Assembly symmetry: D2
């Protein structure tokens, strides 16, 4: 029995994915918007396509595949009439703010974002075992961490990482402006028209990797380039390894760790081929480069992800695992 | 002493208005007001994704931007009552926020000490609406708050004026094919005003939306009152737009007669085009409307004629230039 | 005995045509022809920027693709009369290259031994032109080359049929607001066919361009012969379109009457929509045309009425489904 | 006492912008252009440009010529350079901008037609010297007939890579150019002429991985970096304007400030220095071949080991064009 705070991109897609899930179901959503607008945006999606199911608005609820889900329009989480709250508003990104859902009535909580260093942070398929169930607020990290972590863990376990720099070439998101206009958080680059620009912007995914993979703590950093695609992204990591490697060995080790969370690709795919996938990360063997200069090696590895759907499915896999405890 | 202008809302229209007034003689911007620190505003003034780098010097100071050496005071007060327009000797306020679009709200600037307001949007019917080059003569000087109409109205009005004078208009339906604007969302998300179509990702969609522009032609040209209506389709270009009018005229016409009549009426406000241009060629033009003779169609069936005429506009720069022309005329009179 | 189809031009329409024919019974694609090695065609069949991954299996063999376990021979002959259509027993060619869009050019396939050709485009004024759901009865099977018209005609025709049948049309002007297509350049560059507007960067511009969909409507709906014309505005969406028709009707009308008549005429080819949808909601629909009742306008000024009706279409998938409906109907008589 | 008379082969993105730039130059003038198209189309694309704006000058048509700022420029449409009247017109240098003659034997056709020298607007193979103006133009000794102005990415990377090599020493480095899409990509998903499965995909819809030899070419432009760099490209949906990231291991310790101060110290007309929070569209139309962005400099130190990222912007159109013109003027002066 799950509940979704923030019926945004992540919140609405989560409901779509939970609709296919057993033993947990979305019982209620909360947003800042009337139900008619939430229902419309659930049914019709510019990048994820039409919802595959029935969705109609009843009195104070929406009916998805025959079942009723209550809808609320409150900007105060403490005043929510609440087992697990998917926190997807983007405004309660730490334990103190997310503790307000617990004092609204609900037991546990999964923050759909980095939740700080005082909350356990799980990338499903990498370190979900660190959870023992007694946690009240957990974090599923960022979209980029879920892409970076499986690739980086394999590099750490199989060769060891001295250090690495990341570049995520990222779809634009709603925290960028449609056209040039003042930006709420003072970011001079996110203020620019999103669909017209390559936009450099900072990201902490690589620096914070130690929360998911302790043995990479302090070894990675990087930054982002936002580009005019509405969803679909990739993460490059340029690293110095501790032992020699070939492109073939690197790719072979990637394939060995492939799972429902970590896909392995050998086709000449582009970003739109990645829209809607359910892997949290899709390794691209075609982009692996090991460059050797006088015995010294420098390595580039690349993984794709749908920053929307890839993260949503990871959010649901982690949500399911956390519930089984 | 120059006419002293203050800009309320340093947005798309506000910033370009500053650019155009910088090149004008006899008038200068003394202050701008917005919701933002001066550093964010200065950056957006220098760098523009569709209109190019600012061609001039622009520097940051303590609560001010210095444009071509001149200090422009920067305020960040969302209540226009409290702005020091009186203290600064402001003559005219360009009201460009999108939030003070009627007579009583815009009169807060006059209570703050300014003499006149021009609203950069439709301002209600108890405020005169001026499309420069069509009906500015309706001003008699005693007005305090006026409107420069919408971007689309400034595009349609000169085209409709020629059709009415030369042939007479029975009725007409407009379709504006419009660049997306800041009132549309970057990605699918809740929309503040409840618009299920403006809620959708702007650069991904053909987005139908309503507009009162064709109805308001009935105000700029009274002999067209109740005769026009239309709608909009927002499309994924960041600026640059066109207006189509399908009309029933009262007298027979040919494609050549319509085009010749458009050219004869061309001016600094109403341009005349015969090239095979597309919307990006229209970015940054200074005509309020650019008639496209290549798209004129007069279709005759059993004596009955149905006419399509098309004009381009940069919904940003074209409108800004009409806004500045009206401002200069209004400040003189 | 299944109806054997070949696809000439494995492009946007050609590849989607294979997807739809794969789901059909009694008809199957035996071969495709393009100017390209099979790996490139297999790759593009599998991966599609606007229509999504192929929902099925697709693998490469020697100069052939295997779709859902079935071999489809692949050819690369740019001259269609040298294709082995007769030898393979090909009943119908879907002509989707954009280079053989009249009777003389498309007859190459009959010279190569195929029995019938359907052109996925306007085929000129001297070939039967069919919008499925409007006029497929004009076919008796003895035709050798027919046209399924353009994407816009399949959008315009069902809407215009209702207006003509229910109210009578004096005249009308169309505007299609259309996704950019492959006949426009990626960036500003010389254009092969000399069009100064299609030369411009497709995804940066509103691009006026001509279209014969309304002017040629008389081939599909005889009572509208010579009564419509119109034009296009190409805009930066990669697929998905709408058609506006501004018309003068012969008798008075209300928006509700127009909308009710559209819904009454709705079918698998002609959808009826009442939601506040935008173009991306229309990518991948199977209606040839989706009428939008929210955009209907009847304007009355001193008794005189001017009418606007608007219909959506996925110029890719909407047209493809119309092409396959026409193909199936044509093959059941051939 | 005669101005340098230039012919432009390929009136494309680079060809047309080169004409704009040469019009502003003293001592050099365009005498003719050649393409595959009638003069009306070339004139139209010269006046109107979706990313670089309207031409700021006069441009009119005549009988098989364009008149730019009052001066006549002859227009030809012959696709074999052997037959061009380069000798008869006294053409000193040909800017080879077609993308179809990017090696020495193909480009020497302009010499056989009567021209004295050729500059290829692209990598030209290894038996043609590759010149990035401001980095290595002194390698020309005058005896060259055919030279290359390299690629846009090589012109972006080279001044940045030169400062790091001279000031700190470079062990190795990997490049990623995040690059505007170009005309070698398809408008929508379609077969690709050269068999590239990613450039086959819709350009304005995708992040498109693609290979580039730019980082390897630095080993030719800056011989002390031979064999030390490689990299690749991601084409993204902006119509022009790009950046190049370099992740490198240096030979001596460095800080962000030292790296930036050295970049600023080397700035010139070719190599710009930026400290503002700019995005790609701010770079459209710049005349630097490379614009270093001090705001993206990163030095990461982990247990004494350092890894360095430096980033430079470029307008792959105008930045390269101005580099092309500088190289032309220098090459023409010998
Ligand atoms: N968008 C992505 O690609 C992405 C990827 C990974 C992680 N995330 C994270 O997920 C979170 C949500 O981002 P998003 O993409 O859904 O953006 P969004 O703008 O689509 O989602 C926010 C939604 O919640 C609503 N909302 C805002 N404040 C609220 C409040 N106080 N109470 C209730 N509803 C409120 C908004 O109206 C909107 O519908 C953020 O923390 C973001 O960093 C997003
Ligand atoms: N953009 C166009 O094409 C266009 C064309 C014609 C007319 N207009 C009209 O011009 C007006 C402005 O449009 P825009 O496109 O420039 O919008 P915008 O969002 O780009 O700019 C509006 C600015 O006003 C500021 N603002 C908002 N509320 C404020 C307040 N209370 N006090 C001070 N500053 C405040 C915002 O911070 C923002 O910078 C609107 O009324 C719009 O309808 C726009
Ligand atoms: N794209 C649409 O929205 C749309 C809609 C309706 C109708 N149509 C029509 O369908 C046709 C194809 O359009 P498209 O968009 O699919 O084009 P496309 O460019 O995507 O596909 C054309 C294909 O034909 C191939 N081809 C070209 N010349 C050939 C030859 N001589 N022999 C064999 N193959 C050849 C090309 O290599 C390419 O794969 C055109 O007539 C077009 O007007 C297209
Ligand atoms: N676009 C960039 O950012 C960029 C940057 C640096 C270098 N370059 C290089 O410059 C060259 C041109 O690139 P572009 O982007 O201008 O391409 P383009 O497609 O815009 O221009 C090529 C032009 O050459 C013409 N042409 C082709 N074959 C011809 C022939 N046989 N004879 C005469 N004219 C012919 C074409 O009609 C076209 O106008 C390529 O080698 C490219 O790699 C491009
Ligand atoms: Cl970095
Ligand atoms: Cl309407
Ligand atoms: Cl028309
Ligand atoms: Cl690489």
């Amino acid at each position: 029995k799950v509940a979704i705070n923030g019926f945004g991109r992540i919140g609405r897609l989560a409901l779509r994915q939970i609709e296919k899930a057993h033993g947990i179901e979305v019982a209620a959503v909360n947003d800042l918007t009337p139900a008619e607008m939430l229902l419309h945006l659930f049914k019709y999606d510019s990048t994820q396509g039409r919802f595959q199911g029935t969705a109609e608005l009843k009195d104070d609820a929406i009916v998805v595949n025959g079942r009723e889900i209550k809808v609320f329009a409150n900007p105060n989480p403490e005043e929510l009439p609440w087992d697990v709250v998917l926190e997807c508003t983007g405004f309660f990104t730490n334990k103190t703010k997310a503790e307000a859902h617990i004092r609204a009535g609900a037991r546990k909580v999964v923050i759909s974002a980095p939740g700080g260093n005082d909350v356990k942070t799980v990338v499903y398929g990498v370190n979900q075992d660190i959870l023992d169930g007694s946690e009240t607020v957990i974090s599923a990290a960022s979209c980029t961490t879920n892409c970076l972590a499986p690739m980086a863990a394999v590099l750490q376990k199989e060769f060891g990482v001295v250090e690495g720099l990341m570049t995520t070439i990222h779809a634009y998101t709603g925290d960028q402006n449609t056209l040039d206009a003042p930006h709420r958080k003072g970011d001079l680059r996110r203020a620019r028209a999103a669909a017209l620009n390559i936009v450099p912007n900072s990201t902490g995914a690589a620096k914070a990797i130690g929360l998911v993979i302790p043995e990479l703590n302090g070894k990675l950093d990087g930054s982002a380039q936002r580009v005019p695609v509405a969803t679909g992204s990739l993460t490059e990591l340029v690293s110095v390894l501790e032992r020699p490697a070939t492109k073939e060995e690197i790719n072979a080790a990637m394939k060995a760790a492939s799972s429902e969370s970590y896909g392995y690709n050998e086709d000449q795919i582009v970003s739109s081929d990645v829209v809607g996938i359910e892997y949290g990360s899709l390794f691209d063997a075609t982009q692996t480069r090991v460059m050797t200069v006088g015995g010294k090696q420098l390595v580039k590895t690349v993984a794709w992800y749908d920053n929307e759907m890839s993260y949503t499915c990871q959010l649901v896999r982690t949500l399911e695992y956390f519930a089984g405890k």
